[PDB]
Design a protein around this ligand. Sequence first.
Ligand SMILES: N=C(N)c1cc(-c2ccccc2)c(CNC(=O)c2ccc3c(c2)CCO3)s1
Ligand SMILES: N=C(N)c1cc(-c2ccccc2)c(CNC(=O)c2ccc3c(c2)CCO3)s1
Ligand SMILES: N=C(N)c1cc(-c2ccccc2)c(CNC(=O)c2ccc3c(c2)CCO3)s1
Ligand SMILES: N=C(N)c1cc(-c2ccccc2)c(CNC(=O)c2ccc3c(c2)CCO3)s1
Ligand SMILES: N=C(N)c1cc(-c2ccccc2)c(CNC(=O)c2ccc3c(c2)CCO3)s1
Ligand SMILES: N=C(N)c1cc(-c2ccccc2)c(CNC(=O)c2ccc3c(c2)CCO3)s1
Ligand SMILES: [Cl-]
Ligand SMILES: [Cl-]
Lengths: 229, 229, 6, 6
Amino acid sequence: GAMGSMERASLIQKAKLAEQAERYEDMAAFMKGAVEKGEELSCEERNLLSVAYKNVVGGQRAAWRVLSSIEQKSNGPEVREYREKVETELQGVCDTVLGLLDSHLIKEAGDAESRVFYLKMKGDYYRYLAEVATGDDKKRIIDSARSAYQEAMDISKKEMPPTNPIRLGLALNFSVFHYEIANSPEEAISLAKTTFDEAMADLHTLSEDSYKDSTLIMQLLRDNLTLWT
Amino acid sequence: GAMGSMERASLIQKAKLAEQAERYEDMAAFMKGAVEKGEELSCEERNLLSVAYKNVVGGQRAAWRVLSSIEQKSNGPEVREYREKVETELQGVCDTVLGLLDSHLIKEAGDAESRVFYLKMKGDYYRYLAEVATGDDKKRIIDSARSAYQEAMDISKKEMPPTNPIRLGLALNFSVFHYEIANSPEEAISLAKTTFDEAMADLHTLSEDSYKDSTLIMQLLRDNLTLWT
Amino acid sequence: RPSSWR
Amino acid sequence: RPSSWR
Ligand SMILES: N=C(N)c1cc(-c2ccccc2)c(CNC(=O)c2ccc3c(c2)CCO3)s1
Ligand SMILES: N=C(N)c1cc(-c2ccccc2)c(CNC(=O)c2ccc3c(c2)CCO3)s1
Ligand SMILES: N=C(N)c1cc(-c2ccccc2)c(CNC(=O)c2ccc3c(c2)CCO3)s1
Ligand SMILES: N=C(N)c1cc(-c2ccccc2)c(CNC(=O)c2ccc3c(c2)CCO3)s1
Ligand SMILES: N=C(N)c1cc(-c2ccccc2)c(CNC(=O)c2ccc3c(c2)CCO3)s1
Ligand SMILES: N=C(N)c1cc(-c2ccccc2)c(CNC(=O)c2ccc3c(c2)CCO3)s1
Ligand SMILES: [Cl-]
Ligand SMILES: [Cl-]
């Protein structure tokens, strides 16, 4: 890999610089290089990985939606061709992230905090594949997302408090999966509501700073429930 | 070139799609391909070329400024290395644009409208090279920017009205060159002020739509004069 | 579209 | 920084 010659510490340092510079493709390439060194990612480093690829794939998803809308409106080959180009690039990014998780972040994740984080990511990047998938490939991809999300949920409920921000962000995203991908809006509402209520009932245990962490994601659960009910 | 197999019309169509999708690197690659077909660019197509590369180099310049500030504050090799990486990428983009202008947009620009547009671009991309240049290379680059800007100004004053938006945007950018690059703030103020006043005195000749085009750039001249005086 | 955590 | 036309 092109980052194979760079020190792990230098890659992490440059990922943080790339974030400051809003250079998210660079950030992701640096974090890919860091992962491929084969050592643990810290909590901070996991967040750097997630930030980098979420920004990369976010730009791709937004472009894909614009082109897909134009394509649907028009129903020459150019719109389809360019949508397919963006789609292929998006799928490649998701494949890369899933490859890092499977080789070997997840199996080497030696506690619940780290394993839940990576399994949430697995669900997210299968979800992004599902958004652009069609037909029978779509069904298998949807099942892979659900399975990863569900395993993360099982661990998080056993090992993390209901206000833990990774647990909350996992539940938020699994609820979006249910509503937008799985045509299960009732499941989506049930999950967002129980997650919100159980976080609220646990806020009394938190410091001012942890309170701010948890209420930030609670806000997003509330916004979805307001959209859905 | 990688766009050599695609029809000119398809490249222009896809440049417009890439703009809608905020995919400016794609947009620039499509417009590079269109230029390299060797035919005229229309007014619309020149604007597409300019939009694409201005967005690409704008992201690079913003990143460079962030990294350069961090580098100066710190005065390991990582900050310098990553600044140099962004800088090299920025210089490559400027070299590409300048190469399209020199081979052969400018010489084939068979009227004043098109030649002024391309000479303004030549000044702009030499200016962006000057921003990151040091020492004696910097002096030659500064002279190349001034020379391109001045030739565009000479033609625009002879052949375009003082409210023409390309003429106004040229004067705006040459004034910025004087202030920021050439350490000639008096020249910058003199140019922005004469350009603004002579545009205002010509507004009475314009339709409602041309009036809006011209006053948009006049706003930017005013903002700079307010900063500088 | 609904909000997700990023 | 001053404004330029883009
Ligand atoms: N380089 C990054 N981007 C991150 C680095 C870390 C980190 C740093 C040191 C130790 C452990 C983790 C992050 C985790 N914290 C958040 O994500 C977060 C917290 C509060 C908050 C928001 C986001 C949005 C508004 O309010 S993110
Ligand atoms: N056990 C916990 N509650 C946490 C422990 C740490 C930690 C671990 C090691 C070193 C330093 C800090 C956290 C850092 N904060 C996050 O990672 C975070 C992630 C996503 C997010 C938010 C915060 C707020 C909004 O969304 S949180
Ligand atoms: N299908 C459901 N479960 C719901 C049905 C209704 C309802 C019932 C009768 C009349 C009108 C509306 C609900 C009311 N809305 C909320 O209760 C709500 C609750 C908690 C919460 C947020 C919103 C955001 C953050 O946390 S919810
Ligand atoms: N695809 C693009 N981006 C462009 C296409 C054209 C064009 C289209 C058809 C014929 C000739 C030129 C442009 C020229 N018009 C402007 O640049 C412009 C006009 C008014 C205005 C602003 C910008 C900012 C706010 O008010 S830009
Ligand atoms: N002779 C003129 N006054 C113009 C003629 C044309 C044209 C030519 C051929 C076909 C269709 C239209 C113009 C299109 N508009 C621009 O190209 C433009 C560029 C930059 C800019 C603005 C506008 C406003 C803010 O900054 S303007
Ligand atoms: N060094 C110069 N030439 C100037 C010196 C002064 C000044 C002189 C004495 C006292 C205070 C200020 C100027 C006043 N400011 C403007 O006149 C101004 C004019 C036109 C205009 C804009 C701003 C924006 C758009 O168009 S300008
Ligand atoms: Cl394409
Ligand atoms: Cl580097």
